[PDB]
Ligand binder design. Structure first.
Ligand SMILES: N[C@@H](CCC(=O)N[C@@H](CS)C(=O)NCC(=O)O)C(=O)O
Ligand SMILES: N[C@@H](CCC(=O)N[C@@H](CS)C(=O)NCC(=O)O)C(=O)O
Ligand SMILES: [Cl-]
Lengths: 210, 215
């Protein structure tokens, strides 16, 4: 049985949702191990993942990192679970495109809001500037996602791992006090994602409600 | 013939779009499917005509009929689904493919961004000589720490797939960026040998020719 190491509420939410969909749709249970930021820098965890971060999926002798690799792997093993919102190559790729945008381009913009560059620490003006630029970048990227939702209810034909990724980044925005109320589709999107049983179960497990 | 055109890749020569270019060349060589390559300028990708195809104004972009597909990882996973026989991830087996996909993701999502400040200095450092030097040094250090991790893998593996893969193509082009930037990685001893192995691949060789990367 596979095991996922994750930080609750972090990007590892997405493979956690994927695993729960596999559970609900393909009848395969899995283990979730919530980790602390202290544990992931521990000698024990570093021996499994020298990069000292999450997600990490363990499936027997396979220790697999990277959000996109994990979910593409699960999709290959369990095509019937429709992790990318469809079974057809074209539609899966379109959802994979959104996942990749979120994971490679958007998540990136958040990094300075979670961990300030070393050169900025103690510099009030530079710190403010870096945080401002991150906020502006995020809002510009969210506007692009929001525009898509003007004509589509999800980032797949049905709900997909891309939707889970945007959802969690919007939860980060709420926690950081980065408002997105001007992007008119995002609130309803969050409600639709929250209505999915797999998402609901994971939000419960990771302590994300309320 | 008149109803189905080859796939078309828009790319910047020598940039990250090299990777799906190599993927398409491998599909050509191994699955006998030709494709079109359109080299673009940095000016053309900010043009009105191009923004109509790709509002994000960057590359790669793969057009296959009515599908306009962006993102390196999405493009290569798509081609792998259509042409599994091409072994774009260095294997046909799900676990071996996933391990290669993990390296591709590391390169595309984690390492590539470390280069960003070296290609385009953050605006707030413009005109600030000391901050500019600190940013560039720190970015160079970050890249080398990430490359050291790739180097370690190569201590007991010939490639990042079981056979050569899109992950190898991604590291390769980043090491080409390092050379072009003057970022010395020669203390990581597996990397030069790795570049030679990658360059020996027929598909890589073909794409390097097409993109003008030989010297
Ligand atoms: N490209 C990686 C990025 C993973 C990543 O950024 N992980 C972060 C957030 S989930 C993390 O573990 N941060 C804690 C730390 O690095 O100490 C992936 O997609 O898996
Ligand atoms: N996450 C995107 C990143 C695309 C990207 O970084 N593209 C660069 C090339 S390395 C680009 O288009 N740069 C535009 C320019 O240099 O003007 C992907 O994987 O496709
Ligand atoms: Cl994109």
């Amino acid at each position: 049985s596979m095991k996922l190491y994750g930080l609750t509420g972090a990007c590892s939410f997405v493979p956690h949702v994927a695993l729960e969909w596999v559970k609900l749709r393909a009848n395969q249970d899995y283990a979730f191990q919530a980790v602390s930021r202290e544990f992931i820098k521990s000698a024990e965890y570093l021996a499994l993942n020298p990069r000292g971060n999450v997600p990490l999926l363990v499936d027997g002798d396979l220790a697999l990192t990277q959000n996109q690799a994990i979910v593409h792997y699960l999709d290959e093993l369990y095509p019937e679970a429709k992790l990318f919102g469809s079974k057809t190559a074209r539609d899966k790729a379109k959802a994979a495109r959104w996942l990749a945008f979120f994971n490679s381009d958007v998540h990136k913009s958040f990094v300075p809001l979670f961990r300030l560059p070393s050169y900025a620490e103690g510099n009030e003006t530079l710190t403010k500037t870096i945080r401002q630029q991150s906020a502006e970048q995020i809002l510009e990227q969210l506007a692009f996602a929001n525009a898509h939702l003007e004509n589509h209810i999800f980032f797949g034909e049905e709900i997909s791992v891309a939707d889970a990724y945007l959802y969690i980044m919007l939860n980060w925005c709420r926690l950081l006090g980065l408002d997105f109320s001007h992007l008119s589709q995002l609130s309803a999107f969050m409600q639709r994602v929250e209505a999915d049983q797999g998402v609901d179960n994971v939000r419960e497990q990771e302590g994300l409600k309320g």
